[PDB]
Amino acid sequence: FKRAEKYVKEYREQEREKIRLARIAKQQGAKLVFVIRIKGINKIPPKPRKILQLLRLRQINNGVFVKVTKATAEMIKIVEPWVAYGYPNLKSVRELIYKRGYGKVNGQRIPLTDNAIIEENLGKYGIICIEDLIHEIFTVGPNFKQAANFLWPFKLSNPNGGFRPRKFKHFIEGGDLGNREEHINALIRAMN
Amino acid sequence: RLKPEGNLLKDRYRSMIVRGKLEARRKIPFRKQAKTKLTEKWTFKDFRI
Amino acid sequence: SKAAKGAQAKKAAQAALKGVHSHKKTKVRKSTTFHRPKTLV
Amino acid sequence: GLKADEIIAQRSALPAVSVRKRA
Amino acid sequence: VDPDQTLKACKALLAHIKKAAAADEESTVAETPIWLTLTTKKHIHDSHRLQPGKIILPHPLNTSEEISVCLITADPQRFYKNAVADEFPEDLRAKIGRVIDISHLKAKFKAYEAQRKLFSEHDVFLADTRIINRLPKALGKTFYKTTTKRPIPVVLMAQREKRDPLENANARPIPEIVAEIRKAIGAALVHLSPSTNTAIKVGYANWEPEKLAANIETVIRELVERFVPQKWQNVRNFYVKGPETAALPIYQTDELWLDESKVVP
Amino acid sequence: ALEKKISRALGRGDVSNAARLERNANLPEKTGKPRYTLNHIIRERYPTFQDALRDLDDCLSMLFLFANLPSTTAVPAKMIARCERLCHEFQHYLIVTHSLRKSFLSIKGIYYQANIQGEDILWLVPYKFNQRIVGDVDFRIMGTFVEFYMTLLGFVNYRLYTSIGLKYPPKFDQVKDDQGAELAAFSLEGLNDPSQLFANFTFFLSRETPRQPLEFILRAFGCKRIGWDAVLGEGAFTTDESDPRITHQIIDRP
Amino acid sequence: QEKKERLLREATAIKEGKKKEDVSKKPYTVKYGLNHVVGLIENKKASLVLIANDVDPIELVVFLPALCRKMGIPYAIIKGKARLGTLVHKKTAAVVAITEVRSEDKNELAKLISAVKEGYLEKVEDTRKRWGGGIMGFKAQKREEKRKKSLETA
Amino acid sequence: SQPGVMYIARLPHGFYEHELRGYFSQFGEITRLRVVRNKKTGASRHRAFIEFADAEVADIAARTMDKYLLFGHILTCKIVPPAQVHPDLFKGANRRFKVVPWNKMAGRQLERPLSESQWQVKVAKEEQRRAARAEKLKEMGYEFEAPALKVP
RNA sequence: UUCAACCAUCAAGCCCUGGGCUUGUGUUGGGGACCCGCGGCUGCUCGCGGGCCCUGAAAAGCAGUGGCGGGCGUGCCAGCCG
């Protein structure tokens, strides 16, 4: 059974999100950011849903690397209520790629247990090892798009699941919208 | 281009068992649930409209 | 049927006025004998 | 005044009952 | 626009108002606003602008001591309350009847009856420009269905993370605040709506017709210069009228079209 | 009982009381240390520091393995970071005492043999890659082993640093850690011949070379100036490859 | 902890030579305690009364709806003396009362009072005067049904 | 059998056609539904009529949601009698009530070019408007010499 | 089966050194008299926008206009334009 208060709350959330998206589209207007999908409004408008589909952030606690351009900044501004993003540092990038790094070959998820996969799949771009992949991601090279599409989205963990009274609690609470800058690294340390 | 072989976590676990600090046991993915019966609460039975 | 429609309306009214936790879990007891539970000593 | 304040402060006509005079 | 026709209209409107009130007498003649009416060929704006524009007058309005002014600032309200209580002149201290920040406004005046009580308890509302975009939602249609008591923008920000209100207020100096508040209280208001009509309160009936003439003329120059698109080619008609009187035309155009593109064969 | 009290506080809605009681829980996800203190157990299990040095093979293999694992509910990320910190402190002791003797690159990992106080210590470190956690191992009881072994290694590191007269724990730079210093984030301060094989050389490690084993081996066998690529981390002697002061360069590209 | 912090601030105010009213503000809390709430109802200071449905002995609250009706106080019977105890930081509260709230919650209090008046009191106006109980057991009801159908058939 | 009509008022903002249909479809099948709205702005007048297939379902829903406190509103839910239900109560039901910009239409129609004949109509009309205003200003004691409008 | 909070608590751009200007669109619904401006309506009147009051976040048919796409010509759009 569904409550009338839930119906009204969903309508008001949809109206507020429509107003926000219309304001962004009317107003219009290269670094590396790490973007993590967090829980937000259950009903997503088609344009933020399509942007999340393109950024492969369909599942909660998924993390991706994004190169900051005008179009990417516009898309991140569109999907701020469902994501938390910031500037990752060298330790965060290195630990994410070495500990939770998976490669997309033939559409399947295979971990980066060797330099052989990187040499066979990105060797045409000059990337022959995991450290070359880290270099491309961190310095945002010409082949950053190919490196990011090779990298599978990262599945981060929920530390609250280790404590029984707060087992069901989500780790990241929504409400702190906008860029977290260097404070995304605390979340990366906690969830990786 | 070296391809590392084996699994070092499995190696440490096998070393633990072989040296005898613990015995070899299998993972239990599903535990048997308690046999219970579902019933309706008295307030929800006595609700009338 | 009219009885089914009425039952649906009664269930909706019960959910609106009391909630959805309408059921309780009850142990199955194979014996009629009750034993004192073993507690920490 | 406010209708909300009137609703909160509305009572009956029966006079109040006190155990004792208070400071 | 010839000034003699306008100043003749000033005597005529004042005489008609006085003889209509004669049918307290002085109190009835007083507190009767004088409205300058703009009629344009097109809509003056493409949307409802809810922040009034200020036109500075040689003879300021709201100079009476009984006018109560409510000032809405950003957080905290304590700093501005202390500024009013200590470092303001006595006339402004008597005129300002309430200082409240946006957080307390959203907390204590969410109710429609609370908004109507706040509307009735004051005459002129001033609002800091840092929070004036949030005031339509905080004050509702109570303050914005009628253009009379819409919050007038004032600048209190010190001209150049999340600011802590207790630690810092980010405010311009107090004499600058005093000058800005006095200027905004004395200024006349223009309201932009998608309409051919715009009404501006330029004076009262108890004023002198020359002061009406000067105020109307400066409102004419500043309004056609700043807020009217396509300048005088959009200007159709200018009227002067009271709340109950008829409209006296002080300027009527000769062409009813914006340009030659409207005329088609 | 404390967890029951926390559950009662959360069920009654006392968030401040729940937080205050949770501060007494000493959770590994908050402290980076094991939930229960095993200091009295360490002395009981190892009557002598010689016995501790003889069990250091298993201790070092377990901790160097777990320093490269992803965060789990059994082994949280802060406790993994503490594993890495203890391994780095042990490596720094080996560097400053030149106790490292042999190394071997096998198909399973890198074997290291050192000599601490006349005891041969041999342990295996995985290559820096993604490690697979399979279902055929009991990961939670492995985590209990990890907790015991870090409790042992903390006291072993303290005794070694105090014996060679250095302050323990060493000064650690969090800014350099987030910039990726790894072994270079530690500053060793005083309290209150095969060792000089690479003494006169200047080394440059390229991007595709294993930075942590190469730096550990070179600094243990006498190198004082090792630079590397900027992506390999903070703390290089020289970031620029074209520097004329560098004598040797490690490359592994075709 | 909040009371300790407030007393520390008041102690600093006394030390610097100010009244404790200069540093502390008038509090607004939920009133509780059975004797205190009964006194507030008798003095007609309570705006809303919530009475637990499971008070044992029942004589502690059996007069209280009639007292509220005599004094013209809006009352409501609510499930959970433990639930009221969660409000008042106790294991159990027999009754709670609202006398006055802050200005930002005066509208919410008035709307809650009107909602109670229109949705509880008017609905229980006629049912509160009836007798309870008198229900038969399952087998007794089935025996009575069999008896009445037997009598109707015969 | 007999259909049921329920009048619901004190609707909070957001509790509109789709929300009403989805909520009361849990109670029973809804055949018709209409929220009363202003034609000038499209805004709801906080009242609606719901026409259920079954009168007992409508009656149960009305007693369930009568005096319901929702978003600061105490909802009104009553069953109207079949004698007092209007035959044209549900005209325009089961469809969107569009927000038509009459003000934008007015702006655009004053922005449209017009031809010279209807410009003659407009100008001539406004001279008798000026004439009526002037003969009203005769009693005013005010004289305005209105300049002659040049003819296109 | 969570009725919370979340706009800009200032940014960007002009003048080029004065502290001023521009943009950043954001309003519960009704009722009562009544002065108007402009569009149609032969005209009454009807719309658009102003002026003066009243109101618990109040409520008992009267629903009114041209289309793009989408769904099955259409009392269909949790999609838009005019």
Numbering used by the authors:
A (entry chain CM): 51 to 79, 87 to 249
B (entry chain Ce): 395 to 443
C (entry chain LX): 12 to 52
D (entry chain Ce): 85 to 107
E (entry chain CB): 18 to 40, 52 to 188, 204 to 308
F (entry chain CJ): 86 to 277, 362 to 423
G (entry chain LG): 106 to 259
H (entry chain CI): 184 to 335
Authors' account:
The rixosome defined in Schizosaccharomyces pombe and humans performs diverse roles in pre‐ribosomal RNA processing and gene silencing. Here, we isolate and describe the conserved rixosome from Chaetomium thermophilum, which consists of two sub‐modules, the sphere‐like Rix1‐Ipi3‐Ipi1 and the butterfly‐like Las1‐Grc3 complex, connected by a flexible linker. Upon rixosome positioning, the other sub‐module with Las1 endonuclease and Grc3 polynucleotide‐kinase can reach a strategic position at the pre‐60S foot to cleave and 5′ phosphorylate the nearby ITS2 pre‐rRNA.
Low pass filtered and colored maps of different pre‐60S states.
